[PDB]
Curated annotation (Swiss-Prot):
Keywords: Cytoplasm, Hydrolase, Magnesium, Metal-binding, Nucleotidyltransferase, Nucleus, Phosphoprotein, Terminal addition, Transferase. Residues 3-356 are annotated as: Mediates interaction with DNTTIP2. Residues 110-114 are annotated as: Involved in DNA binding. Changing residue 194 to A: Nearly abolishes enzyme activity. The chain holds residues 149 to 510 of 510 of the full protein. Its cofactor is Mg(2+). The gene is Dntt. It comes from Mus musculus (Mouse). This is DNA nucleotidylexotransferase. GO terms for cellular component: cytosol; euchromatin; nuclear matrix; nucleoplasm; nucleus. Changing residue 319 to A: Nearly abolishes enzyme activity. Can also utilize other divalent cations, such as Mn(2+) and Co(2+) (in vitro).
């Protein structure tokens, strides 16, 4: 029996139900835009469970025994079986508000509120926004427009590996014992991504050394002329706080960057000679490295279901910093992700199996 939880499913990149899940993902995105959180969640859970199937749905009988498939979702599946298209997803793709929100939020630094503001001002194209002489842009949006074409082209694996080399070379210059791990989509086996994410941790660094590393590494890149954008968020981490009851917040020190990646550093099959790459770095205390790795690997749906399962099924509280057992009244320690899954009574799910 297929579990309702993504953390009890193996979800690999060979999606046999892309016709159904692309439509359900569009409908979920539109519900997010229309602030309908409930309908958004129902479409996301249905899309997630179909992504886990080892075969394509070709009839309504194939949906028997599958959880998270309500009446609304089954009507959408029936319509796609009928003529290979979703009339519901097609109407969203042609909606002017949806098209504007997708286009405007494709810019780094533009979220839901700014996209809504520009739409209500009558803007529909990025050309009209960028050339407007009355609009005022944040430093994040200025970088978003300046490096737009590079950032929208996405990052491939030779580029992600080239960025990994740069990150490791910079980090070990200040902390030679530091462990640098590529997380996010690339760790889940994806061929492309919108950014490259890393977890950095050091077994011997002090509290102050841990705090200064991201400042030292970004100053080094700024000196080399590689830092195109930088935003460092200071840590608000509390060693003895209970994990979140909430989409959990990450309190570790982190930075959101845009780096200049020279073409000569990329060893691939194939203009200006460089590409702007979105890079996120997270620094965590050594003892919390397994919780942080698990939270930063994703997918978002896998993380949500992991935390939901921990709370509802095990009376445990899980977040990126810790695992707390409410019955035993103890924090549970882990040196690896495998130990976290064992504490939760879950079969270990490999990172490439977390594409929920
Ligand atoms: N800018 C950011 N802010 C907060 N968390 C982030 C983050 N970037 C990465 N993460 C964390 O690490 C995982 C990957 O996050 P993202 O970079 O936002 C999407 P992704 O799964 O890596 O697809 P992508 O390859 O297109 O970026 C998620 O589990 C998320 O919690
Ligand atoms: Co990412
Ligand atoms: Co990221
Ligand atoms: Na955006």
């Amino acid at each position: 029996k297929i579990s309702q939880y993504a953390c009890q499913r193996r979800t690999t990149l060979n999606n046999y139900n892309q016709l159904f899940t692309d439509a359900l993902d569009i409908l979920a995105e539109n519900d997010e835009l229309r602030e309908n959180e409930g309908s958004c969640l129902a479409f996301m859970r249905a899309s997630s469970v179909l992504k886990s199937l080892p075969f394509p749905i070709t009839s309504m009988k194939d949906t028997e025994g599958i959880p998270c498939l309500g009446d609304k979702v089954k009507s959408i599946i029936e319509g796609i079986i009928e003529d290979g298209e979703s009339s519901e997803a097609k109407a969203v793709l042609n909606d002017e508000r949806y098209k504007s929100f997708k286009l405007f939020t494709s810019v780094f630094g533009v979220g839901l509120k700014t996209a809504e503001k520009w739409f209500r001002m009558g803007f529909r194209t990025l050309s009209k926004i960028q050339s407007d002489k009355s609009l005022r842009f944040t430093q994040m949006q200025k970088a978003g427009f300046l490096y737009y074409e590079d950032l929208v082209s996405c990052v491939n694996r030779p580029e992600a590996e080239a960025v990994s080399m740069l990150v490791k070379e910079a980090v070990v210059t200040f902390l030679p014992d530091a462990l640098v791990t590529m997380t996010g989509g690339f760790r889940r086996g994806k061929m492309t991504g919108h950014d490259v994410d890393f977890l950095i941790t050091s077994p011997e660094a002090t509290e102050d050394e841990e705090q200064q590393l991201l400042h030292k590494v970004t100053d080094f890149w700024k000196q080399q002329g590689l830092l195109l954008y930088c935003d460092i968020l200071e840590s608000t981490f509390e060693k003895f706080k209970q994990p979140s009851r909430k989409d959990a917040l990450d309190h570790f020190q982190k930075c959101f960057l845009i780096l200049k990646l020279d073409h000569g550093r990329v060893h691939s099959e194939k203009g200006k000679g460089w590409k702007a790459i979105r890079v996120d770095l997270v620094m965590c205390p050594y003892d919390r490295r397994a919780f942080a790795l698990l939270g930063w690997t994703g997918s978002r749906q896998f993380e949500r279901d992991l935390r939901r399962y921990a709370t509802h099924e095990r009376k445990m509280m899980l977040d990126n910093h810790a695992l707390y057992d409410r019955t035993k009244r103890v924090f549970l320690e882990a040196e690896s992700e495998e130990e976290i899954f064992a504490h939760l009574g879950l079969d270990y799910i490999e990172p490439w199996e977390r594409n929920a």
